[PDB]
Design a protein around this ligand. Structure first.
Ligand SMILES: *[C@@H]1O[C@H](CO)[C@@H](O[C@@H]2O[C@H](CO)[C@@H](O)[C@H](O)[C@H]2NC(C)=O)[C@H](O)[C@H]1NC(C)=O
Ligand SMILES: *[C@@H]1O[C@H](CO)[C@@H](O[C@@H]2O[C@H](CO)[C@@H](O)[C@H](O)[C@H]2NC(C)=O)[C@H](O)[C@H]1NC(C)=O
Ligand SMILES: *[C@@H]1O[C@H](CO)[C@@H](O)[C@H](O)[C@H]1NC(C)=O
Ligand SMILES: *[C@@H]1O[C@H](CO)[C@@H](O)[C@H](O)[C@H]1NC(C)=O
Length: 487
């Protein structure tokens, strides 16, 4: 921070810069009015050169490289010329590829040394040396920071030691496994930046713009059993996300929401879509338009934990994570994709059931959505959801017609119906009565009243591991939870 001429903190040896059609932003600090020349080299050969100057009343400089085909290695040099003085900066083993930012709370923070099969996962790096990794230090700030205050893991080739460095240290398992899966598909460099902090609500990760857009109340005394990390508005946006916003990138994956179970829960269907839109706007502008204005944003629908049976804050958050549609992308969440995780539970996790150890399936399901939404591939990435319902009240039956094929295991409490009688509505279990390839028939005979709604898997812990009642027969994806109201 005392060195006058330097790169921004996202720039280092071994990094990945965003590939074509975007141009990669390179920025740093230097002496006011100095000229800065940025050169991309392949050893001694000049690939491209960009020239700029440090603005007269600020001490930063920025260039945008021409778009690059993925691959490498390259070296980036920056030279500051100021009068008769010459200072140079150099980073090597630079690759061009897709840069993904991974963020959220503790289930993004959980590292490869904490997951199932860790020994073998930590050893599987030789084929993935072009999946480069980076982890942001846990820092909060009361104002937006221009540059990261601290980096835990600077850009690196993956090794046993840095993938599994410590419990909730680095490297994020969901992030790593997502990138590894993407590398299998894309076969060009992937950069992974993890920026997460356990026990944090979405308000900490939101700029003031998205909070204002949602009418979020002014902060009071926020800390509780479920909010254990920084909870002041925007303090993690300020320090751990905003400093990256000028860096060109491909997309974001996100795993957060547990700490909103009792913190502006009823606003999460606003604050999460608003965060996505605000990060998009801010990163698009910061990167001089190079990051896509609607860059793909993927997220994990909350998994389960062993809660009180009556607690339905997690089901509410899961619904709000989809802006109350049940699926993404949707009208309020364009170019988003979701991994369902409620069936990826872990009764015996040494980190608590709130921190389940199967991150492999989470990253697999995320990478399906990325392939479809971020890369345009015709790959199934959504689980079966009803597209219409037919109530046969005289027969005591409710037909659910699904838009995909279903594989169904008998489970007479996973569906519930809202039965309104005697001036009250109660949720009653709805047994499964009959099955066809895309139609499930529920029995409603226990409802001696009017049927107002139906819901599925509306519980904090709806099933045992990979034993939810409804899956697609071959995509491996579970039916997502939902609620649907009768006309
Ligand atoms: C444990 O981790 C290892 C390493 O990732 C897995 O073995 C790899 O499995 C993939 C399939 O996902 C193969 O494509 C690779 O060739 C394997 N690599 C190595 C080095 O063996 C193994 O499948 C994992 N097992 C469990 C139960 O998670
Ligand atoms: C990172 O992006 C921000 C925008 O989000 C840049 O700030 C803008 O800079 C332009 C050009 O100097 C000004 O006209 C705008 O008023 C600035 N906007 C804001 C909101 O500050 C910022 O300069 C970028 N960082 C670097 C190093 O260039
Ligand atoms: C959060 O803001 C409150 C109220 O302004 C203040 O007491 C404190 O400085 C902040 N907390 C932390 C941990 O920074
Ligand atoms: C968010 O959910 C709450 C609680 O169900 C509801 O009252 C509100 O209308 C929802 N808002 C949006 C924008 O979906």
């Amino acid at each position: 921070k005392l060195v006058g001429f330097r790169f921004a903190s996202y720039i280092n040896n071994y990094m990945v810069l965003q590939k074509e059609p975007a141009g990669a932003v390179i920025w740093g600090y230097g002496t006011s009015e100095a000229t800065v020349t940025v050169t991309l080299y392949r050893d001694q050969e000049t690939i491209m050169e960009k020239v700029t100057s440090v603005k007269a009343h600020s001490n930063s400089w920025m260039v945008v490289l021409d778009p690059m085909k993925p691959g490498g290695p390259y070296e980036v040099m920056a030279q500051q010329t100021f009068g008769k003085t010459n200072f140079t900066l150099r980073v090597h083993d630079v690759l061009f590829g897709d840069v993904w930012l991974c963020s959220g709370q503790a289930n993004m923070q959980m590292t490869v040394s904490q997951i199932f099969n860790a020994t073998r996962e930590l050893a599987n790096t030789a084929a993935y040396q072009s999946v480069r990794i980076f982890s942001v230090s846990l820092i909060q700030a009361e104002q937006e920071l221009e540059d990261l205050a601290k980096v835990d893991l600077q850009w690196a080739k993956p090794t046993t030691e840095n993938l599994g460095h410590g419990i909730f240290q680095y490297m994020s398992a969901v992030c790593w496994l997502f990138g590894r899966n993407l590398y299998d598909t894309l076969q060009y460099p992937i950069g992974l930046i993890s920026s997460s902090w356990g026990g944090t609500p979405i308000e900490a990760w939101s700029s003031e713009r998205s909070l204002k857009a949602c009418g979020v109340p002014t902060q009071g005394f926020t800390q509780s059993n479920s909010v254990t990390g920084p909870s002041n508005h925007s303090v993690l946006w300020n320090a751990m996300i905003h400093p990256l916003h000028n860096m060109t990138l491909k997309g974001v994956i996100w795993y957060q929401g547990e700490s909103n179970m009792n913190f502006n829960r009823d606003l999460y269907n606003c604050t999460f879509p608003a965060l996505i839109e605000d990060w998009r706007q801010t990163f698009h502008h910061g990167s001089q338009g190079q990051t896509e204005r609607f860059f793909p944003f993927g997220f994990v629908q909350l998994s389960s934990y062993l809660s009180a049976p009556s607690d339905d804050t997690f089901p509410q958050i899961r619904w709000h994570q989809t802006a109350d549609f049940g699926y993404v992308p949707n009208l309020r969440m364009p170019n988003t994709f979701m991994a369902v995780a409620m069936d990826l539970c872990d009764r015996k996790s040494p980190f608590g059931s709130i921190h389940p150890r199967d991150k492999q399936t989470v990253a697999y399901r995320l990478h399906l959505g990325a392939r479809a939404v971020a890369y345009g591939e015709k790959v199934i990435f959504q689980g079966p959801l009803p597209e219409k319902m037919e109530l046969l009240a005289d027969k005591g039956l409710l037909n659910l017609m699904y838009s995909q094929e279903i594989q169904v295991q008998r489970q007479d409490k996973i569906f519930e119906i809202s039965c309104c009688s005697d001036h009250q509505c109660k949720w009653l279990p709805a047994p499964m009565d009959a099955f066809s390839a895309q139609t499930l028939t529920l029995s409603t005979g226990s409802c001696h009243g009017t049927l107002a709604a139906v819901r599925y898997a509306w519980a904090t812990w709806p099933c045992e591991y990979k034993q939810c009642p409804i899956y697609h027969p071959s995509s491996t994806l579970p039916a997502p939870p939902f609620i649907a109201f009768m006309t």
